[PDB]
């Protein structure tokens, strides 16, 4: 289900990219926020039998703290009807995704 949360994050980044209007952007980011907070609660396959306080487990969860804060900054823009500003903000989300997607 952790895998499917990543894919929801990945899928909605494509929708934001192609989006015509603020509604399409807003709906995508809201789903992304939920997928990221659910993912946080999970444990990736390599770290299954690690400590919940392991430096790798904190970092794994930390990746989603960064993502949520970025989704929040873009949600503020999208809530003001600012499509291009939000799409540029969503651009910085990809950089966070790529840095954490397969690190674990």
């Amino acid at each position, epitope marked *: 289900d952790l895998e499917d949360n990543w894919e929801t994050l990945n899928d909605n980044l494509k929708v934001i990219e192609k989006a015509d209007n603020a509604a399409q952007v807003k709906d995508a980011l809201t789903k992304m926020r939920a997928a990221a907070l659910d993912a946080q609660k999970a444990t990736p396959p390599k770290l299954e039998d690690k400590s919940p306080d392991s430096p790798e487990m904190k970092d794994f969860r930390h990746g989603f703290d960064i993502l949520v*804060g*970025q989704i929040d*900054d873009a949600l503020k823009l999208a809530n003001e009807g600012k499509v291009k500003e939000a*799409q*540029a903000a969503a651009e910085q989300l*990809k*950089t966070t995704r790529n840095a954490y997607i397969q690190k674990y």
Partner: antibody
Amino acid sequence: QIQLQQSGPELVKPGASVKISCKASGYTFTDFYINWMKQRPGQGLEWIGWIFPGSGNTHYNEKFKGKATLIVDTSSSTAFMQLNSLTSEDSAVYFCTRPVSYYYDFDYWGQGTTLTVSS
Amino acid sequence: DIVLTQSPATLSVTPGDRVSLSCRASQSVSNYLHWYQQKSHESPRLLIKYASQSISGIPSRFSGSGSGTDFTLSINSVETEDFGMYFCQQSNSWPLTFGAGTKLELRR
């Protein structure tokens, strides 16, 4: 009319702190990510971190997470970078910059701030 | 952290000649790779974004190509005003990283 305007050169003593300013104008300051960069003469640039001035949310290069602290005064549309515990290794040109986007024609750079850390 | 290797460190050319500047990533950065010119210590000038997308106003002699790890900035017919430093930057993943630069200089 889109500019980033940094404070003038800084001469600072080892151990002291400094605050470099980045004044945005000609666009809505709170709506765009601001990156900070470090460059020694003729050398490759290093990324320090970004701040989203709308929220004050920040992300740091691990290398600078104990050296630099990014803040904004959203009233004056000014980004600030605080450098602490300064040594001669912090002597450099610092740039604030709106990064390249698929969605905007251009990126934008401050003129740069030269920091000399010397006794 | 992703390492960007720029070869060679120095490129000697005559005005009018073709030239190719190499930037190799130590892991995949897709097309998230940008090219800058810097004459002195002044702010870098974006030439190419997303590997091969030219910037509004950049003269036709500049083009970029590549995706994944191997990138090339090409100057069709070098101008005197092209002599100076060239940097590549990846925005694939944190931290943002740059090459150490290639210097384009007059040959003799």
